[PDB]
Amino acid sequence: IDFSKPFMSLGISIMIKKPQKSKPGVFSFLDPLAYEIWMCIVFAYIGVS
Amino acid sequence: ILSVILLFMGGLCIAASEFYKTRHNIILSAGIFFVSAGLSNIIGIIVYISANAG
Numbered sequence: 488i489d490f491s492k493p494f495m496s497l498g499i500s501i502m503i504k505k506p507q508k509s510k511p512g513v514f515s516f517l518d519p520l521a522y523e524i525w526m527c528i529v530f531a532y533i534g535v536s
Numbered sequence: 537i538l539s540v541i542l543l544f545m546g547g548l549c550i551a552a553s554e555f556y557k558t559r560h561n562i563i564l565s566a567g568i569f570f571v572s573a574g575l576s577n578i579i580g581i582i583v584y585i586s587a588n589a590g
């Protein structure tokens with residue numbers, strides 16, 4: 488058959504799952520340390536006092 | 537388990553205090569037994585959390 492001129496140029500692309508904006512949590516300033524450290528600091532604080 | 541033993545020894549001192557109301561270093565021993573039991577508990581918490589991290 489004899490095609491006509493392309494009316495839509497395309498190709499092979501890459502599709503991935505759209506990511507999320509990862510809205511920071513309210514209490515995210517605690518993230519640098521683990522929950523165990525934060526809990527142990529309170530225990531250490533009480534003990535020292 | 538040391539905390540459990542240190543807490544038991546502290547409680548024994550409070551009972552003994554009731555009898556020997558003239559020996560004031562028994563109440564002091566109880567206070568040190570209760571403060572050292574809490575410090576033992578702290579170490580146990582840190583040892584438990586640091587041994588389950590593997």
Ligand SMILES: CCCCCCCCCCCCCCCC(=O)O
Binds near residue numbers: 518521522525529532
């Ligand atoms: C002076 C010693 C204490 C200072 C104040 C530190 C405040 C942090 C304690 C609360 C945080 C507990 C952690 C639970 C939340 C989490 O990180 O998942």
